[PDB]
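Subject: Interface between my chains keeps coming out wrong

I've been trying for a while to get a sensible model of this assembly. When I model each chain on its own everything looks fine, but I need the whole thing in one frame so I can look at the contacts. Pasting all components below, labels as-is. Any help appreciated, I'm running out of ideas.
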Amino acid sequence: PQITLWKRPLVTIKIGGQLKEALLDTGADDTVIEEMSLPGRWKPKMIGGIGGFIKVRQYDQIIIEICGHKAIGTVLVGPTPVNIIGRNLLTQIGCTLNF
Amino acid sequence: PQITLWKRPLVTIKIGGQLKEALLDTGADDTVIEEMSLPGRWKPKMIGGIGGFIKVRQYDQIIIEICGHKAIGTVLVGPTPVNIIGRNLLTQIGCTLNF
Ligand SMILES: NC(=O)c1ccc(CN[C@H]2CNC[C@@H]2N(Cc2ccc(C(F)(F)F)cc2)S(=O)(=O)c2ccc(C(N)=O)cc2)cc1
Ligand SMILES: [Cl-]
Ligand SMILES: [Cl-]
Ligand SMILES: [Cl-]
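Reply #2:
Try treating it as a single job with all components included. I did that and got this:
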């Protein structure tokens, strides 16, 4: 589809068997999801921006379904104010910016 | 143009007569530029980032070029990790997400 930016570009995603609302975020290098269980090993990481930094757990090789498009990649889990789909997964579904 | 997301969508902007690098950030509601001199009065604005909320300065009706596309609108000034072109101006220049 084509998504305009009058409002936040929120979509429904499926991750770890849960449905969640997430923001298509071209400014995010990686995907960041609110606290949840994910299977596998993880390593701690810090990410930040305006307001400072948060600590997240980095899980690799996680499958997420985004608007019917399956993509696999790294997911950071931690206290993000909003669920974020970052570039690492946006590329996999063929998402571009156009103007 | 059509911009893919394998790398950060960094573009050249022109503001206050000077060229700067900025990030096309669909996850940002607003446009936030690093400390510089802008004309006119400013108003207070609280924005929520990944790490918390902070106060920045809001200037309205500011002339700005983004990837050569002329725009006029609201620009916030504050301690941002990189210059950010957010949804307010992305919308104005006709930028959509597509997949
Ligand atoms: N390192 C990572 O992978 C990472 C880092 C941060 C995030 C959170 N998402 C980013 C992108 N959109 C806004 C958000 N932020 C932009 C941003 C942009 C770039 C970077 C950096 F280059 F450092 F990696 C960090 C943060 S933000 O928090 O500074 C922000 C929030 C709101 C607004 C606004 N209202 O205009 C402006 C800026 C997600 C992932
Ligand atoms: Cl990845
Ligand atoms: Cl591609
Ligand atoms: Cl505006």
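Reply #3:
Confirming on my end. The two ends of chain B are 15 Å apart (CA to CA).
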